[PDB]
Point group: C4
Chain length 301, copies 4
């Protein structure tokens, strides 16, 4: 009966999104593609490695199916080899290449029991090559499988519109962080992208912006549900941030969150940018506003 | 006959906790749960991944049992398939589905020897699917096993009450670090959580506190048994730290310790927070106090 | 129909280098060698580990061939053992050691089906040792395979000559970054190596140079195609950088780029140094210059 | 014919230590022990994990032998089970438990061919349990094997006595770095341990020392063979470093070196401390002194 840990016995957690589950996934910067990145498209030699990338993302149901497809294709190739013209391997329950398929599945996977017919050395060599390849394939598939597990998932990026509301008599901006996975130790850094008035982009196009203020007062260590926030009044590029000026430039607000996961420690980072028109007025100050009386932590979308 | 390394030939090390071993484990922030974090409960789609989490923590005896249970269940499902209605696979030592169980165990695991009866193609297809699934399962189990080993253990968090005692004519606070595993290179950072007097929590609720002082004079590199300590007299929020004031706010002292393990290098971190009432008066100054005359390092609880 | 992601449906990406693909790879700091580093050559005990290194780099086609070669060699050694002089294992389809080869391949890899002849205990012991070794070998090969995948590729180093051109009425230097793989979050640090005029190298030979300026105004977070740049006019060693002076010293410009890959997070770094004569005059200011009207991102060499 | 890379075609690299190879290894902080650390000895529950540690260090020849020993022991236990009293499994080439050993090796490892005798269900259950355990064991052994490879080796710590020699008319201290493996990107930090004159150790015993000066002018990025160095003349605790004073305290000089390996990126660190009497006078200024005329890099001990 701990204060927070008793929470899971509460009502269903489906409030994040029950209905959208049946709807397709959030594909916006992660749509099905053979590219790793839109800029990465330039490398042409990458075609081999593209498969690696492909096998890494959609792989939950697709990988198993893909592996099965590869199995069938590879096995049939073997069957064709069986028909090559050396003394054939027969005496399998199904006559013809079907029989070849039947014993060869055992070879390209594990190893055949009563299919004791390596009568011809040519057939044997073919089978031997298949054995080597098949065990190699198993290692490859297992390696890929582990690699997929190794890849962590960063749902921490979330998606929410920035809100510019006053706080402490000072104009400020606020961003919603995500607690979707094991988020317990993240820290964040804010980057902004403003274009100068004179930025015809013939010179130092795209002025990089250092806005440490979003995280400066906000250093988030008790990350169980922190919000990031900067102050406008100080000396910062954001002073002149009126909407029209922001619109003129390609004002982009970028926030990155990264830290250990408490789980096997990997530094998981997240990238999320919001457009200048994604900023919202102070009217959003109403916030989530807990509906349950008392200090309670609730997650609703 | 080195100075410290001769120590293991001394008396039993059981002083950390011999009797408590039979008692249940320290479940306080790590109780058996299907949640990853109390906040993480909100994500509902996580149910699949919950199993991953589950298989990662309690897994020492439970994993093997679980795997066996899965084996039995999966195998019996196969047996049911054997009874599907195609020409059945018989001619196994035990008649009936028991025989099916007997040969199928070989298929869903490794591969059957004298159970050379893939007489019917329908039976064969069923067996083939089982073979594919079984080898996949082996890869999955091995992957999970390695992943578990990959997860490091951080006993370094320990548990001890803070002590506010005077030192060098200056009021200070002290925290006991843990040397439970391979702790040789950790470094630490201190975070505090104070509530403002005016913190009705309608504004910037929960004032984050930067208290680098705990580690500031204490940078711990010779980590073989270091204690962390801050100074109150300087300008710090802790100046006004009288107990009544601390009680009013939800004064929380948080200390994190992290560094390489000398072992395959992973950055292992630890999180441990102590309540404001977990702070103890200066009377704790007596310390462990070595009982063995001379400079000796002893670990007793 | 996103702004950048629609790009892959454009023309072929082969512009990075279609013809050079048939030409040998860029071997300059990575030529075929048994050394790990030119300085690493000094360690002689490393000969065993040299193989590890060797198996890690060229391994795409070479590893499979090497493994096959090892298989043949190891298997033949087993065959020799078969001929040791204990009662021989015969009754294999091919008489003689060929038969030994035939059944032994099954033993040193997976396990033999109808080769049920462990008639002599001496033969059996030999086979048993082979079984143990073979399964160990499989584990070793799979481990090496995964390790290779674990190794990331850093094409991000690229190769381009530095350009010293004026910008904003201030003399500056510019370096081309690479987007060849998944480069999305890199950051960079600049190091320089100048020799003092008086540097007879009898004292503090080789004055290390701190040139943070290359990245100082350039902190690259929107890394989709950033260029690094320092300023000469400020107080920096580069003020006196006239070509003759640079030539006198062994002026070396070193830039390192590193950051998370968004992929399983590993910190991938890159090292690339350019000679003092690799610096080019301001005439290179023409830049790539997009040929497609409008703001477009194109990758051409 | 590159400048440094042609070096390996030179004379033998054995100069690091040809004869000492036959001599036992440098066991000083890494002697055969069941402890992870001298302080780690305190945890008693660690006994299980001690084996993990043990299997990780000496494992090059020992692991294979250990595994074989475990195989024999586990297999014999199975044989005992065969003799349990259920209808026995006979009809193996060797009569008695020897036969049991013979077929059981196939079960606890891979899977038996002509040993088609699971005649009794009790025998079968025993064999089945063995199959499950054996495959699990294989996974465990492979996991351990990969884990060992994952562990990097840091020979970079080296061992050399500090030298306090004058440089640039300023008293300085110098330390020899090691290039033994793939050392290309390390950086270093210096820590010192001095005891105060008044340090009866009743107060803040052991004054931690921040000596960033060793690396301050020395930031080592061109790490192909850099030496670390601090300056005494500035304000530093080292000003009063006369030998007698150092002797009074337990002056310890600690230097840590860490950075990416260019190899699969792991941050490999190294810890090495030197006693106050390990410091040497300025007479060591003679240095290695290259014997080969011209600027050449040679590694001799």
């Amino acid at each position: 009966m701990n204060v927070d840990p008793f929470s899971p016995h509460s009502s269903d957690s489906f409030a994040q999104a029950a209905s959208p589950a049946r709807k397709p996934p959030r594909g916006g910067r992660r749509i099905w593609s053979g590219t790793r990145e839109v800029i990465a498209y330039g490398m042409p030699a990458s075609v081999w490695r593209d498969l690696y990338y492909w096998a890494l993302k959609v792989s939950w149901p697709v990988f198993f199916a893909s592996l099965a497809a590869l199995f069938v294709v590879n096995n049939t190739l073997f069957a064709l080899l069986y028909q090559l013209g050396d003394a054939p391997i027969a005496n399998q329950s199904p006559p013809g290449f079907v029989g070849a398929f039947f014993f060869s599945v055992e070879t390209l996977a594990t190893v055949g029991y009563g299919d004791m017919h390596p009568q011809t050395v040519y057939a044997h060599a073919i089978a031997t090559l298949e054995c080597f390849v098949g065990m190699s394939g198993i290692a490859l598939s297992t390696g890929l499988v582990f690699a997929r597990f190794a890849r962590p998932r960063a749902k921490i990026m979330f998606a929410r519109h920035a809100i510019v509301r006053p706080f402490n008599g000072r104009m400020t901006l606020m961003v919603r962080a995500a607690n979707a996975r094991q988020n317990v130790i993240a820290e964040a850094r804010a980057k902004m992208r403003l274009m100068r008035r004179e930025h015809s982009s013939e010179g130092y196009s795209l002025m990089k912006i250092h806005d440490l203020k979003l995280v400066r007062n906000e250093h988030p260590i008790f990350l169980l549900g922190w919000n990031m926030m900067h102050v406008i009044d100080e000396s910062s590029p954001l002073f002149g941030e009126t909407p029209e000026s922001l619109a003129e430039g390609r004002a982009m607000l970028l926030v990155m969150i990264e830290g250990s996961d408490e789980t096997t420690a990997q530094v998981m980072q997240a990238r999320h940018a919001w457009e200048h028109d994604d900023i919202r007025w102070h009217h959003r100050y109403v916030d989530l506003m807990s509906d349950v009386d008392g200090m309670t932590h609730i997650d609703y979308t």
